[PDB]
Design a protein around this ligand. Structure first.
Ligand SMILES: [Fe+3]
Ligand SMILES: [Fe+3]
Ligand SMILES: [Fe+3]
Lengths: 272, 343, 272, 49, 272
């Protein structure tokens, strides 16, 4: 009846539904003045209303953004206030008419940017998957180092055995200290990242600038790190062939070119 | 100079070599005319003052009449400054056991601004204290660079490249009128920095710019030139935390050809990675006259309880003030996340 | 008290002062309805008022201009009506509150452009020293000529002995004639400039297209040249080495490259 | 001028140095004589321009 | 008196006349409420009026367009509704004052674009001859083919003997079939064009995609082709030297380079 209602000249009762999902956690909002139950999901009513600006599909990712307006107290947007969540918040938009149990999917995407122009409002800019095609695609260089992030699909190195679970001893503005890591050689954890559970099955990740003794340096500060929460810390690969094989014994998968050639052409001037 | 290499290319059995006598005229203020050059060339031979010139005479090649192209390495920086060097105690930075005689970027900018051969601005127009402090800090950090001029572009482009390399802002001070330089470093005390509040001189804050984290790169490629041989070299900077979250690999290439050593390139690349993946918060605040004395690059604190923003350190950006008429002083600020690690 | 008055919520009495200086001559104006005495300097009140548009410091010289609005009869701006003065008019802007003897410097710069959109108003565009960094900086060419303006810091030639003081015989639309210069060889003054005192210690300079006999050709016309005023005329250097040494004997400082090489490479095809 | 300033202009079409100097003098006079630009409003009397 | 009336302060009676000409057919329109006779030509009055936006001569063809506004039922503009006429409609604009027999030419050009924004109006964009200078001017390539359109001033081939006059047997949406052409070898007419008289001395031309047996393929469809009208069909040249000489015996004028050289330099690496 959704299509029939759209074609109807007197039963038009538009209502737009938004679904923000991050793994196992979902946030449901509706633009009407009362909650709507759809597919066993109830959508909350935001005091003040939630509205968008329209959907544009012109083939230009930079121009085809989707804008959401909502109060500054919106739960899903509140997360971005202090620090952007590590994972992207997928957004799905449905369209349905009051009194009908059928809805149609209109827009699908993820959060691109969030800002709070006024205390009584917040503007969210949503981007589609098409915008991820503007970055280069070379991803190849003939250099000495590995040119591969430890654990990627190219290194084929399993980090689960190297996982270390610990409770930090003391947390400071920029340094998190723990005695368990003090037993490892300096720089063992350099290049690794720290992941811990925020809510449900979602974890927030932070990279490590440097590891020295019992003190760990966290890039961008330690804000948001629970002082007593359980933390998982993985090591980091420098990328050198000696580092790759002595520590991880992954030399066969070494993607770097240590000593094949640095400059030698076959159309130079004098070989000697 | 006695260059002795008659058999460099195998001698007679090969292609020859390099054997001869090399005379160098750097072009001092009092440089005289070389009798040999004028006698050989003849005619009206000037002193060739103000420019470095060389005079080679001897064997160049053999067997074949096709001489080969040459490559000459040359250091510089002291013979510049006309006749009066500025703060010479910190003009040069030594790297790699003295192999590389890098120059302080602050000296480069000072020469460009005040150089008689480049812009010829009066030395009195530059705030000596700020420039001296910047030079001292750079020398302490051992942050030197090497450059060559062949683009023939505007001063603005080269100055922007230098600023991006070092991470500094050059602005004409509104109050005293001299050129001031500020470095983007975490070298500030929280207490002494001014604080701005709704009741302390803040009118309205409109823009929030929450930003995003799922985007932004996970791997960064930095390309630099090694001055020992002049061969292109690169280093790789990785963000494991962001990389794990990213579904697919992403990479960008940045060229820092001014960097002469890989360690320095990595030091700046870590700063760039931290800046680009830490998720800066940008604010567009509106202030009253209490923010009159601020200048570009000056950090200060802002607090606004109704907005739920705690005391935050931000760095000034674009400035637009209206002293007469509307009375609106509007500033654009960014969160303070600029720092150059020494390791 | 200036800062205290600015912080004051009830004593705000803004008043903006402008100081136009050209060497030994200063012009003082104020935006209020009465004259203000500051640092023993009295600022005139312009009937109709003087006001600006605001100060912008964004790091872009093209965008950070300062605009002044004033009547068309303003004395300082009146000079630009016929021809732009040779020297740049430095401008300094002060800020003070009525009843206080302390002022703060806000803007410093020089006149960039002046126009008269209406008979009752005039708009002045002021530029800062940062805009002078857009022009190139090569300033080097390997050509035969000197590549140096006679008298510059590179030529190191003193023109004071060559100064000639004379009273012109007759002045025409484009030609100024004097019998004293008739005694010099043709082209002796070619490339030189004529400077004469306008007011105080400031002189206006004009270049010479050509010198022939008793007649001098002035680039851009002779308008503004006093018919009986005292004029100082300097010679001009062609730039050729023979010209440089025979006339001025400055060959050691000759910056040109007459016969070092025109094309000869060391990586060509055939030396002969 | 307090400090030296220079610009480079290419006239590759010019086959002789004297002609290049002739046009360069024109360019210098134009660029350093301080032209006055006006934006006037006229009635039909300026129809044939 | 036209100039005198323009200078007159009380006799101003402006009236703008438009003349659209295409060979032997002319369309005359006026912006007044009554017909005007000028040079023995009467200009019709369009119910609703015809007006322009102004004349701009800034030296930029892209910016110096001329816009005409008229109802959607305008006869001259009605032709463009279905398909643009093959020939360009030259437009000449006159200016005259009511009661005077003298007029002055103001604008000359041709139709550039036509659109119908509203049922009650139509907008015509007129372009001047200066806009035809934006396309390249190379018009030269060292390829094997002729690089010349059959019949151009370079081929110097007379197509009048090859003209074929016929009445089509059957016309379809995309194919026009005639038995007379069935007697020619396949591909004989490929590359040719069909011209037929529309009105007066003006013909509309259509190119041929392919010729096969008794069926002719028309590029862009056969719409607008009269089912019984007389049609003139010319052949087409493939451009190959063998094709050029065997069919047309125009080898001396062959502009192509069949076998002079494909790559051979005189500064290569190894001749053998
Ligand atoms: Fe690896
Ligand atoms: Fe000279
Ligand atoms: Fe042909």
């Amino acid at each position: 009846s959704f299509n029939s209602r759209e074609s109807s000249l007197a039963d038009g009762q538009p209502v737009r539904l938004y679904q923000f999902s991050r793994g196992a956690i979902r946030w449901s909002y509706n633009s009407s003045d009362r909650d709507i139950t759809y597919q066993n999901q109830i959508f909350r009513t935001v005091p003040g209303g939630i509205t968008d600006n329209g959907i544009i599909c012109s083939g230009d990712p930079q121009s085809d953004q989707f804008v959401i307006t909502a109060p500054a107290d919106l739960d899903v947007a509140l997360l971005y206030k202090t620090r952007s969540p590590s994972d992207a918040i997928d957004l799905v938009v449905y369209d349905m008419h009051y009194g009908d149990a059928e809805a149609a999917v209109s827009w699908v995407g993820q959060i691109g940017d969030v800002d709070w122009p006024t205390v009584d409002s917040c503007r969210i800019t949503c981007v589609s998957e098409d915008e991820l095609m503007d970055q280069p695609g070379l991803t190849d260089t003939y250099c000495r180092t590995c040119t591969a992030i430890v654990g990627d699909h190219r290194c084929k190195v399993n980090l689960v055995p190297y996982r270390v679970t610990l409770t930090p001893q003391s947390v400071s503005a920029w340094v998190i200290s723990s005695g368990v890591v003090a037993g490892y050689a300096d720089g063992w954890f350099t290049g690794g990242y720290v992941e811990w559970q925020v809510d449900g099955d979602n974890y927030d990740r932070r990279f490590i600038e440097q590891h020295a003794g019992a003190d760990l340096h966290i890039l961008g500060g330690t804000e948001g790190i629970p002082a007593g929460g359980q933390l998982r810390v993985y090591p980091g690969c420098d990328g050198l062939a000696q580092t790759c094989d002595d520590k991880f014994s992954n030399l066969p998968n070494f993607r770097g070119f240590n000593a094949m050639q640095g400059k030698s052409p076959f159309d130079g001037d004098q070989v000697w | 100079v006695r260059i002795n290499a008659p058999e460099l290319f195998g001698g007679d059995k090969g292609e020859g070599g390099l054997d001869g006598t090399l005379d160098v005229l750097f072009g001092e203020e009092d440089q005289g005319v070389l009798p040999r050059l004028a006698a050989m060339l003849g005619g009206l031979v000037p002193a060739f003052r103000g420019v470095t010139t060389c005079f080679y005479s001897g064997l160049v090649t053999s067997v074949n009449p096709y001489p080969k192209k040459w490559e000459i390495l040359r250091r510089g920086g002291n013979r510049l400054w006309d006749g009066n060097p500025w703060y010479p105690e910190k003009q040069f930075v030594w790297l790699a056991d003295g192999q590389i005689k890098a120059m302080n970027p602050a000296h480069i900018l000072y020469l460009v601004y005040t150089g008689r051969d480049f812009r010829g601005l009066a030395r009195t127009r530059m705030d000596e204290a700020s420039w001296r402090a910047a030079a001292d800090t750079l020398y302490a950090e051992g942050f030197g660079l090497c450059f060559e001029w062949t683009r023939s572009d505007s001063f603005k482009n080269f100055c922007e490249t230098v600023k991006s390399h070092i991470g500094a802002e050059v602005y004409p001070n509104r109050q005293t009128g001299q050129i001031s330089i500020r470095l983007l470093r975490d070298d500030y005390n929280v207490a002494d920095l001014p604080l701005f509040d709704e009741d302390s001189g803040l009118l309205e804050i409109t823009q929030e710019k929450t930003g995003s984290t799922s985007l932004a790169p996970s791997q960064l490629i930095v390309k630099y030139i090694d001055q020992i041989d002049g061969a292109q070299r690169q280093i790789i900077v990785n963000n494991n935390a962001v990389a794990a979250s990213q579904g697919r690999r992403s990479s960008e290439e940045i060229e820092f050809l001014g960097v002469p050593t890989g360690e320095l390139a990595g030091r700046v690349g870590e700063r760039e990675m931290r800046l680009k993946t830490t998720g800066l918060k940008r604010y567009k605040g509106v202030f009253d006259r209490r923010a009159r004395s601020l200048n570009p690059g000056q950090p200060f604190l802002i607090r606004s309880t109704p907005r739920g923003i705690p005391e935050t350190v931000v760095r000034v950006g674009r400035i637009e003030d209206n002293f007469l008429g509307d009375g609106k002083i509007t500033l654009t600020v960014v969160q303070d996340q600029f720092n150059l690690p020494a390791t």
